[PDB]
C-alpha cells in the first residue's frame, strides 16, 4: 500500500511505518448522518411545565341566559378579578393545551453494528484531502496526510508545545480558530451558551504522556483516546473529515481495533469489515468498455419534425390542384 513518515520534536523524519487496513474502506455519507442524529439526542435533560399550572382557582360557568359566553369564570369579590375567564387554553392565566410532561422519550436507539461501521468509515475519511478541505480545515502548508507524531516528545510547557505545532504547518489553522470568537445570535446567549468557536485539530493518544497537558490550553485543540473515539468528535455537525494528529502508538493500534479486510476483529467481537454493492462511484464509465460496445446497437440520429397546420406553411408541404373529372 504505502509507508508513512514519523515526525520528531525538531521536525526531522527518519523512521517509517505501514498504514492500517481501515483506510481503504469506502464512505457512506447517509449512514454517518443517520448515526450522528440519533447519538446527539442522548445528552438531553428533561423539561416540563408544573403539573397543575393554570388550574389553581375556584371557577364555575354562569350558564346561559346572562348574555355571556359559557367559559368558566373566577368566583371572587372586591377585586377586578371577579367574573374573568379562568381555566381554558384560550384564557389569560389559564392552562396550556396538552401540558408538556416528563414521560416523553428523550433518548434514541441505534444498532451496535451501525455504530461500529459509521465510526470505521469516519476514521477513513480523515485521510482523503477532498473531505478534509471540504469541512473547512485549511491544509495548504501541510506536507502530507496523515500526521504521526513520535513518542519521546519530552515537552512539559505550553511555550515549547506551540513551537512543535507550528513546525508541522498548523499555524494558519490555529489562527483561524483564535480570530473566530463571537457572541451568539438569539436567546441562547442568556442560557449559558454565550460564545461560539470554530472546530480545529483533534489529538489522539492511547498512552499517557505530558504532551496532553502542554497543548490543551491552545484554542480549538481537542483530545480523545483511540479506544473510545466518538462520532460526535469524528464528524461534527454530521459532516465527515476532521483533521487528526495521531500519536505513533495510537496509529499502530488501529489494526487491532478494526482488524483486516474480510477478517474478524479481536477487539470488537462479532464485527468484520465489509463490501459495498459496487466498488466505486465511477461505474457509469463502464459503458465505454470494449465488452459493452460490442453488445449494443447503432443509434438513429435522424428525427421527425413537429406537425404544422397553418395555411401558408401547409401549402408548401402539400400543393393542391383542382381536377375537372366527375368520376
Amino acid at each position: 500500500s504505502r509507508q508513512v513518515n514519523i515526525i520528531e520534536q525538531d521536525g526531522t523524519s527518519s523512521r517509517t511505518t505501514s498504514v492500517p487496513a481501515v483506510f481503504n474502506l469506502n464512505v457512506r455519507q447517509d449512514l454517518i448522518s443517520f448515526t450522528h442524529k440519533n447519538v446527539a439526542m442522548n445528552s438531553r435533560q428533561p423539561y416540563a411545565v408544573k403539573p397543575g399550572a393554570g388550574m389553581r382557582h375556584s371557577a364555575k360557568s354562569w350558564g346561559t341566559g346572562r348574555a355571556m359566553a359559557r367559559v368558566p369564570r373566577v368566583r371572587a369579590g372586591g377585586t377586578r378579578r371577579a367574573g374573568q375567564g379562568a381555566n381554558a387554553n384560550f384564557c389569560r392565566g389559564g392552562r396550556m393545551f396538552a401540558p408538556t410532561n416528563v414521560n416523553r422519550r428523550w433518548n434514541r436507539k441505534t444498532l451496535l453494528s451501525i455504530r461500529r461501521y459509521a465510526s470505521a468509515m469516519a476514521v477513513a475519511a480523515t485521510s482523503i484531502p477532498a473531505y478534509v478541505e471540504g469541512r473547512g480545515h485549511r491544509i495548504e502548508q501541510i506536507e502530507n496526510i496523515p500526521l504521526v507524531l513520535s513518542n519521546k516528545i519530552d515537552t512539559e510547557k505550553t511555550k515549547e508545545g506551540i513551537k512543535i505545532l507550528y513546525n508541522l504547518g498548523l499555524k494558519e489553522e490555529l489562527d483561524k480558530v483564535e480570530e473566530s470568537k463571537n457572541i451568539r445570535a438569539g436567546k441562547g446567549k442568556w442560557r449559558n451558551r454565550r460564545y461560539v468557536l470554530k472546530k480545529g485539530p483533534l489529538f489522539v493518544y492511547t498512552s499517557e504522556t505530558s504532551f496532553t497537558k502542554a497543548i490543551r490550553n491552545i484554542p480549538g485543540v481537542d483530545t480523545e483516546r483511540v479506544e473510545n473515539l466518538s462520532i460526535l468528535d469524528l464528524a461534527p455537525g454530521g459532516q465527515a473529515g476532521r483533521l487528526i494528529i495521531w500519536m505513533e502508538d495510537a496509529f499502530e493500534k488501529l489494526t487491532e481495533i478494526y482488524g483486516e479486510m474480510n477478517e474478524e476483529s479481536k477487539f470488537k467481537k462479532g464485527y468484520t469489515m465489509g463490501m459495498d454493492v459496487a466498488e466505486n462511484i465511477d461505474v457509469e464509465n463502464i459503458f465505454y468498455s470494449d465488452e459493452v460496445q460490442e453488445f449494443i446497437d447503432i443509434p438513429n440520429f435522424i428525427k421527425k419534425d413537429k406537425m404544422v397546420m397553418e395555411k401558408n406553411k401547409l401549402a408548401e408541404i402539400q400543393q393542391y390542384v383542382e381536377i375537372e373529372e366527375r368520376i
Partner: peptide, 25 residues
C-alpha cells in the same frame, strides 16, 4: 484508461452522425 476510451466514442459518433445525414438527403 476509460477516460481516454470516452474520447474514441465521441469521435466515432460524430462521424456516424454526419454519415447518416448525408444518406438522408
Amino acid at each position: 484508461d476509460l477516460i481516454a476510451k470516452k474520447e474514441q466514442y465521441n469521435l466515432r459518433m460524430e462521424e456516424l452522425q454526419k454519415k447518416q445525414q448525408e444518406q438522408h438527403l
